[PDB]
Amino acid sequence: PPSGYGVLLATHDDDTVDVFTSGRKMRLTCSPNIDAASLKKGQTVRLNEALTVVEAGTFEAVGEISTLREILADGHRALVVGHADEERVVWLADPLIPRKLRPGDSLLVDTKAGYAFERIPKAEVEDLVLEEVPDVSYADIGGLSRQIEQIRDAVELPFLHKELYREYSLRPPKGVLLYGPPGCGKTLIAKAVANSLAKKMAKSYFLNIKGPELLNKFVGETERHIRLIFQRAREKASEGTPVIVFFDEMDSIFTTVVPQLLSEIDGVEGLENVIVIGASNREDMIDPAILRPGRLDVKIKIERPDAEAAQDIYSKYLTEFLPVHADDLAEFDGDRSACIKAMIEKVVDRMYAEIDDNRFLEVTYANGDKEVMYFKDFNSGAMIQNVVDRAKKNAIKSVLETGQPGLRIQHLLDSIVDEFAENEDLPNTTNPDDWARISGKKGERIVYIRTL
């Protein structure tokens, strides 16, 4: 028997129900076979030549997909947007009336019938991009153990004493300012503390914002960008996942944007889970207003590489799995770990040696006390990583040319020389900004600097 189909709208006490069919609404009567109360809103029903509902099927699975905008206060209708940026108000189906529907979800809808039947799952990549993988542990950083303990004291201490603060009616400090030398491992401490915080609650987000690129000089747009960043931070804090907001290169900036930043910090102070971490290499240039007691009370000073850390850093980079030359193994009876340790000690000692190969910088003063800085100074974790990469490249070149695999100290020395030659340019044009960049680390203003 030829039987049509339609979409149920609502029920009535008179055992009659409204059905949308063929583009028009009709008030059909329910057959005695079916139970009127058993019908669900939005359920597809079967019609016949006499326009009587006798059977009820499932929900439709094909049609237009619309993005949900909001849910109305009545709890039965939702406002969505169509494919052509056309917004509509459509009734929700029974299955849609834990799980909680959220704005941005994609829903199957029928514009003619004005019903939404199902939710189509979608995977967002913005959350993955915004956060970072907590892959930086305490062991991943070396030579900063006291910094690690200071960060632990500043961050994890209130968590174990939250009830103490609640009884005492106080506000734990959530402001940590990491100030130290030219970018070496300053941001890596932020990754380490984020990973450690993720470990304790056993999902993790890290919002990194640079300083110079944030500036929107023309008219007040930088305040708008900061407000947007803090609104995103609040949205992330809505979810029960710790979020760390990190600001990098904040010495470039600071009647100005400082009051807006202070207001946003005061607003986010209520969210104690969010941790604000700022980095700046020039504590003198930073306006003391942000350093006032309250928000950013905790300040942590970092440095470089105590030589041992460089060795620790080399061990982290030049692990035991790297190939080793047979001739160098002959000096250590085939003990790979001992050979690696001795090679690291040798290269670190040579790098921090006052020799003719360390003429990187020549420093002149007002009295003319021309001295020479060596490779020990200005050493950095990024520079050591680049040295390791260049050494690996040189070892690969030697393998493909000579044919003998392994690692040699000559590769390390060549990588050191090439990387110092490369690094002679990026921080040191020596007319601008170098005077302060060397005077802050040394402790006295330098009239003239030259590169040898």
Ligand X SMILES: Nc1ncnc2c1ncn2[C@@H]1O[C@H](COP(=O)(O)OP(=O)(O)O)[C@@H](O)[C@H]1O
Going through 155-310 in order, the beta strands assigned E by DSSP cover 175-179, 205-210, 243-248, 275-280, 298-301
Distance CA 407, CA 324 (A): 5
Distance CA 314, CA 385 (A): 8
Does residue 382 belong to the site contacting ligand X (CB under 6 A)? yes
Instruction: Establish whether 184 is an annotated binding residue.
Output: yes
Distance CA 292, CA 275 (A): 17
Return the residue of 14, 153, 221, 331 that touches other proteins, per CB under 8 A.
221
Does residue 227 belong to the site contacting other proteins (CB under 8 A)? no
Q: How far is the CB of 8 from other proteins (least distance, A)?
A: 27
Q: Which residues contact 66 (CB under 8 A, 6 or more apart)?
A: 80, 81, 82, 83, 88, 90, 106, 107, 109, 116
Q: Which two tokens stand for residue 165?
A: 């603060």
Q: How far is the CB of 72 from ligand X (least distance, A)?
A: 47
Return the residue of 63, 172, 183, 440 that touches ligand X, per CB under 6 A.
183
Binding region for ligand X (CB under 6 A) out of 136-144, 234-242, 329-337, 356-364: 136-144
Does residue 126 belong to the site contacting other proteins (CB under 8 A)? yes
Choosing among other proteins, ligand X, none, which partner's interface includes residue 77 (Cβ < 5 to 8 Å by kind)?
none
Q: Torsion-angle region of residue 380: left (phi > 0), alpha (psi -120 to 50) or beta?
A: beta
Specify the amino acid at residue 59: F
Distance CA 344, CA 352 (A): 12
Computed over its alpha carbons, how large is the radius of gyration of the chain? 33
Chain residue whose CB lies nearest ligand X: 183
| Nearest Cα to Cα of residue 309 among 441, 136, 134, 145 | 145
Choosing among other proteins, ligand X, none, which partner's interface includes residue 50 (Cβ < 5 to 8 Å by kind)?
none
Cβ nearer to ligand X, comparing 90 with 388: 388
Return the residue of 46, 69, 77, 210 that touches other proteins, per CB under 8 A.
210
Q: Which of residues 38-57 bind ligand X (CB under 6 A)?
A: none
Return the residue of 11, 31, 67, 187 that touches ligand X, per CB under 6 A.
187
**Per-residue binder mask for other proteins (CB under 8 A), 429-448, x = binder:** x-xx----------------
Q: Which residues contact 244 (CB under 8 A, 6 or more apart)?
A: 190, 193, 194, 197, 205, 206, 207, 274, 275, 276, 277
Instruction: Establish whether 185 is an annotated binding residue.
Output: yes
Return the residue of 28, 141, 286, 416 that touches ligand X, per CB under 6 A.
141
Cβ nearer to ligand X, comparing 66 with 280: 280
Does residue 437 belong to the site contacting ligand X (CB under 6 A)? no
Does residue 123 belong to the site contacting other proteins (CB under 8 A)? no
Does residue 142 belong to the site contacting ligand X (CB under 6 A)? yes
CB 297 within 8 A of CB 173: yes
Q: Do β-strands 175-179 and 275-280 pair in parallel, antiparallel, or remain unpaired? A: parallel
Binding region for ligand X (CB under 6 A) out of 29-37, 160-168, 184-192, 214-222: 184-192
Instruction: Establish whether 183 is an annotated binding residue.
Output: yes
Backbone angles phi, psi at 408, to 5 degrees: -130, 150
Residues of the binding site for ATP: 183-188
For binding to other proteins (CB under 8 A), which residues are involved? Answer: 84, 125-126, 129, 210, 213, 216, 218-219, 221, 225, 429, 431-432
